[model samples]
Target: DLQARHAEAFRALHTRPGAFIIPNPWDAGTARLLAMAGFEALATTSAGYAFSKGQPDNAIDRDAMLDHIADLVAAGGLPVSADLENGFGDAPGTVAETIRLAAEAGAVGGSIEDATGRADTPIYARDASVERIAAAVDAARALPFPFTLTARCENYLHGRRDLDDTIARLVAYRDAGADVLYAPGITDADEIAAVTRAVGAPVNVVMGLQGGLLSLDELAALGVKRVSVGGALARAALGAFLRAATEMRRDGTFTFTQAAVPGRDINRWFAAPDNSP
Candidate 1:
């Protein structure tokens, strides 16, 4: 019943009137903090989780990622969506299995990308991509609850800037029964607007690019339904650590300590009944 509740809540968020931000957290602690910060929903970042485990994005195996996702779901008191990179395999059946396992791991929603892991050929063929999304949609439909399946077109991230192709693919995914359509690397305002209009389903935008220059109001004005900050938060946290470590190593000074969050404040937040370990 709890799973169904969370799943229904997550589905409603997409159909709401305006765009909402879904920040990605690398672990359970970060997920709890984001929920406490009043976010409506959260998404896992493949890059963030991989970096935490000393692996590259899309490098971690599916089972390990599912475990991490389960941890976050248990810790956060909000709906969560998983970043299931390439659905952990190239085949449609594998993508379907990934969706089923992600739901069992407590994720109310998940994304499937069209990019093959191989550098030789980054994006999958259009027909294959559609089949994969259709499989995911079938899997979601089989669930006892509403499982939001987001179909991602990775052309922009894979060095292809064809807006027409991006729009066409998104439209295809929508027809394939994907609940949400996303093109992660599209930054231009016009392109964002075009994709939102071309794709009939809800559109999700990634806000990490351009240093998150676009405001929520601006994106909502363009008819965007959801916005996510892929791995920017995790990267920002890592960036601070790297800078502080470099400063300490180079200058032998502790000035970086001044920027650290107060220990008592963090302790108090974590000690709250909702977040207590």
Candidate 2:
């Protein structure tokens, strides 16, 4: 019943009137903090979670990632979309199983990337990508709740900046039953508009990437259904940590406290009733 509520609400967020922003949080603590911000939903960042563990993106194994996703689900108390990087494997069956595991770990939704995390052939061939999502769609539908499955295209990010190919790939995923379609690296406003117009479904436009700085209002104007900050929040948080450490090491001064939140206040917020999602 709880999954049903979250799953329905997550789907509704994409369907109702305008575009919404779902911030990414790395751990249970950050998840609690974002939930305190009253976001309708939350998404997990594989990069963020890995960095917190002193690792790079895609370094964590599947079992550990599932555990991380489960932790966020427990702490956030809201819908969480898992960043199941490439569905944690290269084959359609693996992708399908990953979706099953994501739901079991309490994710109301999750994404599968077409990027293979390989240099030789970074993007999965188009046919394989479509097949993977089609298989994942079957897994999602088999679930007891409405699991929102997002299919991501990596052409733009891999330096294959062809809009026609990107749009065609997205359409295939859409046809394969992906609930949401995403092409994160394309920041061109006109290109974004074209993707939205072509896909005819709720398109997810990622923020915090190098060039695309469109605000919620602007994205809504362009008919985007959802926006997520993938690993960017984690990067910003890591940047702050490094800056403070660098200042102390270089100048022998601890002057970074001026920008710090009150320790006592943070403790109270962590314990506060309002922080509970």
What lDDT does each candidate get? 0.90, 0.91
Model 2 residue 86 CA deviation (Å) reads: 0.6
- Using Cα atoms with residue i matched to residue i, what is each candidate's TM-score against the true structure? 0.97, 0.97
* Per-residue alpha-carbon lDDT of candidate 2 for residues 1-277, written as tens digits (9 for 90 to 100): 9889999999999889999999999988888998888888999988888988999778988899899989999888899999998988898999999999999999999999999888889999988899999999999999999999999998888889999999999999999999999998877789999999999899999888768588888988988999999999999988888999999899988888889888997898888765654
For model 1, residues 60-105, the per-residue Cα lDDT tens digits are 9999989988999988978899999889999999999999999999
Model 2 local distance difference test score: 0.91
> Candidate 2, after superposition: displacement of residue 142 in Å?
0.2
Query: What is the alpha-carbon lDDT for the whole of candidate 1?
Result: 0.90
Worst 10-residue stretch by lDDT in candidate 1? 207-216
Could you tell me which residue pairs clash in candidate 1?
none
Q: Identify the runs in model 2 with alpha carbons over 4 angstroms from their true place.
A: 273-277
